[PDB]
Amino acid sequence: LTPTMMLYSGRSQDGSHLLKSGRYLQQELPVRIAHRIKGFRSLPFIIGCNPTILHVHELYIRAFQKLTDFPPIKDQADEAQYCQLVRQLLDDHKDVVTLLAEGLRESRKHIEDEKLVRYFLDKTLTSRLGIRMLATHHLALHEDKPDFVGIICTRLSPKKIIEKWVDFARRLCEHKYGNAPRVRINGHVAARFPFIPMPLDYILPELLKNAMRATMESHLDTPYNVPDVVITIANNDVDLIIRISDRGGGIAHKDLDRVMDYHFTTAGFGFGLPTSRAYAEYLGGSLQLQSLQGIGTDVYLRLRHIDG
Amino acid sequence: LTPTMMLYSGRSQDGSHLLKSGRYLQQELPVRIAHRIKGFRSLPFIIGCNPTILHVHELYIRAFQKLTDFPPIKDQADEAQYCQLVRQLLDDHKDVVTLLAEGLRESRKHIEDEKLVRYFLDKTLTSRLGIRMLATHHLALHEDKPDFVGIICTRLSPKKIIEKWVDFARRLCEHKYGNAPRVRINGHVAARFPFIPMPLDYILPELLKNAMRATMESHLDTPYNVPDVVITIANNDVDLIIRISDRGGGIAHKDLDRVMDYHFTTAGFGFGLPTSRAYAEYLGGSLQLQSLQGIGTDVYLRLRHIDG
Numbered sequence: 001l002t003p004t005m006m007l008y009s010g011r012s013q014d015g016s017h018l019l020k021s022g023r024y025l026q027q028e029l030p031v032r033i034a035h036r037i038k039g040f041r042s043l044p045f046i047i048g049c050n051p052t053i054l055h056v057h058e059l060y061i062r063a064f065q066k067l068t069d070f071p072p073i074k075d076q077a078d079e080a081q082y083c084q085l086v087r088q089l090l091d092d093h094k095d096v097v098t099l100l101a102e103g104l105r106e107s108r109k110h111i112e113d114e115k116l117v118r119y120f121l122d123k124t125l126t127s128r129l130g131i132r133m134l135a136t137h138h139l140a141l142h143e144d145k146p147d148f149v150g151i152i153c154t155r156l157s158p159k160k161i162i163e164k165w166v167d168f169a170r171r172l173c174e175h176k177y178g179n180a181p182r183v184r185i186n187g188h189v190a191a192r193f194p195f196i197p198m199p200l201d202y203i204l205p206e207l208l209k210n211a212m213r214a215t216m217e218s219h220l221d222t223p224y225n226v227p228d229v230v231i232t233i234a235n236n237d238v239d240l241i242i243r244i245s246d247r248g249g250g251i252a253h254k255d256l257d258r259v260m261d262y263h264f265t266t267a268g269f270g271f272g273l274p275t276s277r278a279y280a281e282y283l284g285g286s287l288q289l290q291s292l293q294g295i296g297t298d299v300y301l302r303l304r305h306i307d308g
Numbered sequence: 309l310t311p312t313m314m315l316y317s318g319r320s321q322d323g324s325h326l327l328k329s330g331r332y333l334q335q336e337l338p339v340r341i342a343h344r345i346k347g348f349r350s351l352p353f354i355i356g357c358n359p360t361i362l363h364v365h366e367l368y369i370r371a372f373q374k375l376t377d378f379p380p381i382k383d384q385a386d387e388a389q390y391c392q393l394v395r396q397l398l399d400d401h402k403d404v405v406t407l408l409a410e411g412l413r414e415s416r417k418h419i420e421d422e423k424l425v426r427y428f429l430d431k432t433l434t435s436r437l438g439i440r441m442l443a444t445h446h447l448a449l450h451e452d453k454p455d456f457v458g459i460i461c462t463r464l465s466p467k468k469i470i471e472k473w474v475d476f477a478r479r480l481c482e483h484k485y486g487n488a489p490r491v492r493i494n495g496h497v498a499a500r501f502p503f504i505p506m507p508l509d510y511i512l513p514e515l516l517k518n519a520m521r522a523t524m525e526s527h528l529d530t531p532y533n534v535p536d537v538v539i540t541i542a543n544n545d546v547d548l549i550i551r552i553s554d555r556g557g558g559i560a561h562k563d564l565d566r567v568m569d570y571h572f573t574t575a576g577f578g579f580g581l582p583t584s585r586a587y588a589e590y591l592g593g594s595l596q597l598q599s600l601q602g603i604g605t606d607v608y609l610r611l612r613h614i615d616g
């Protein structure tokens with residue numbers, strides 16, 4: 001399970017579990033979308049009037065309308081059709097974070113209470129992550145991947161998922177700087193446990209891009225020889241901790257209180273940190289930074305284990 | 309002086325004080341209007357979209373535009389023209405409280421944070437009172453009323469101003485119920501001191517209408533014989549206290565925590581109490597209620613004396 005939300009791990013011969021899942025989505029999602037719509041309605045007028053914000057607002061209204069218009073799920077035939085609608089919405093909404101970032105960038109300056117946008121984005125993006133997890137889980141329940149029940153991996157290796165995103169971030173970095181730091185992984189490298197990869201897929205690349213940009217930008221004289229990023233995995237009975245340590249010079253004192261703000265960037269829109277922290281906390285975890293100004297940064301991602 | 313705002317009591321032979329006053333308004337008002345416009349811009353979208361709210365928003369923008377368009381005041385000729393604009397705006401904006409009450413009535417239900425409207429109305433209505441006091445003072449500086457310097461009365465009798473509003477409220481009450489309670493005034497009935505009547509003119513009739521409605525509605529069997537409203541004046545070196553005591557049955561326990569809310573009424577829009585308290589507090593005073601459920605209510609208006 002996740003916040004106020006359960007991921008059904010049930011399997012059934014008749015496929016009755018797909019019906020149960022679909023029915024669950026149909027009770028759960030419209031309410032959650034409705035809350036987000038209320039969120040748009042309460043946005044400060046000048047932000048709510050932004051055409052890009054209006055577009056997302058309308059997308060959410062349209063999502064609510066489609067889900068509520070969909071008939072009661074009675075049989076596998078209905079459920080199959082329902083999955084089509086779910087796939088459509090997941091796709092129609094795939095650029096929502098980008099749209100919000102864009103619509104909010106200028107318009108948020110025109111209000112006074114800056115805490116407002118932070119609260120709206122935290123609440124909206126985390127609710128969205130939840131919606132997407134539930135929807136994607138339902139679709140995945142049709143899949144027959146070994147080691148998966150829906151989007152729940154029954155034997156996730158943190159080392160493997162880290163390596164996947166390391167390769168991804170190194171590719172981006174190499175394309176931009178001609179090189180990329182190597183990454184060493186230590187600690188509980190052999191750990192394997194039930195876990196939902198999705199949040200890691202969101203968070204890991206954000207933290208890795210940060211460490212790599214910082215490293216390259218602080219070693220412009222020696223792009224061909226930069227210090228490794230070092231990642232430590234700690235697996236215990238309560239949580240999983242992933243520490244990502246760079247020698248990229250640190251987060252400057254004058255920036256430290258701003259890096260967690262949406263839209264703050266020293267370079268994207270500056271969303272990597274605030275989004276990652278919101279997601280971690282939403283899931284019962286945390287994201288903490290330790291800056292060694294002049295040397296580098298240690299970033300600690302903590303995520304709670306799945307309860308059985 | 310009043311909050312962050314000074315009422316110029318200067319008199320001058322050449323009339324140079326009118327120039328100084330006008331110039332002061334021209335520096336002060338646009339900023340204050342601008343802050344109120346920012347207030348409209350930050351209203352929750354769904355409220356800001358209300359056509360009546362939009363109308364007031366536009367009125368404020370138009371007021372800002374006109375003041376800022378008006379040329380620098382150089383001579384009595386300019387100042388005379390300026391007074392025309394001031395009179396126009398005072399008049400164009402005379403129904404603003406009513407418009408806000410109307411535009412907010414339904415739309416405020418659609419947001420979550422109810423504290424929001426209270427804060428907006430408190431801030432907007434008090435800023436408005438300040439704007440109107442300054443504008444009206446400037447115009448009044450042209451007048452030659454004995455005992456007045458602008459809107460500042462140099463020898464206000466609280467008994468006299470109370471009697472003025474007593475007659476007014478009794479007329480309304482009599483028209484509605486066929487009778488009205490008599491009002492007795494005691495305490496410092498002979499008090500006279502420098503004071504700005506304007507806030508009393510706003511507040512006194514609101515509190516008197518309340519006491520009289522309560523009295524009539526609790527004595528439906530004997531409309532021709534209802535208990536007096538009793539008003540006590542206490543004048544000291546710090547403040548003026550006006551206690552208005554009725555035998556109208558009290559404010560019920562179930563209503564007590566709601567009577568200070570805008571839009572709450574057991575019957576207007578339900579604005580008398582929250583507006584009166586906002587105004588009192590804005591001026592450094594207070595408005596406090598003591599309910600004797602089953603008997604009546606004591607309402608205490610406190611306003612600070614003018615500093616010399």
Ligand SMILES: Nc1ncnc2c1ncn2[C@@H]1O[C@H](COP(=O)(O)OP(=O)(O)NP(=O)(O)O)[C@@H](O)[C@H]1O
Nearest residue numbers: 210211214250259265266268269270271272273297
């Ligand atoms: N490991 C790090 N070392 C040094 N600076 C960092 C590090 N991580 C983050 N920062 C700084 O923190 C700022 C904000 O990070 P972030 O929120 O992830 O936005 P961004 O990287 O600038 N753009 P985005 O692609 O949206 O994430 C960066 O721009 C940097 O100034």
Ligand SMILES: Nc1ncnc2c1ncn2[C@@H]1O[C@H](COP(=O)(O)OP(=O)(O)NP(=O)(O)O)[C@@H](O)[C@H]1O
Nearest residue numbers: 518519522558567573574576577578579580581605
């Ligand atoms: N002296 C009183 N005795 C009994 N009830 C009172 C008294 N004063 C106020 N109330 C109650 O408080 C409520 C709100 O008062 P108020 O804010 O002044 O709005 P209102 O009188 O209902 N309408 P309005 O014309 O806008 O002022 C009233 O409707 C009554 O229920």
Ligand SMILES: O=C(O)c1sc2cc(Cl)ccc2c1Cl
Nearest residue numbers: 063086089090093096128135
């Ligand atoms: O905003 C989003 O990303 C999504 S995906 C998604 C999928 C469904 Cl089935 C319903 C709403 C919804 C929203 Cl809102």
Ligand SMILES: O=C(O)c1sc2cc(Cl)ccc2c1Cl
Nearest residue numbers: 371394397398401404436443
């Ligand atoms: O809202 C109001 O009542 C008023 S009276 C008024 C008079 C002037 Cl001169 C300027 C703005 C202004 C406003 Cl805003």
Ligand SMILES: [K+]
Nearest residue numbers: 259261264270
């Ligand atoms: K940021």
Ligand SMILES: [K+]
Nearest residue numbers: 567569572578
């Ligand atoms: K009220």
Ligand SMILES: [Mg+2]
Nearest residue numbers: 206210272273
């Ligand atoms: Mg980033």
Ligand SMILES: [Mg+2]
Nearest residue numbers: 514518580581
């Ligand atoms: Mg009233």
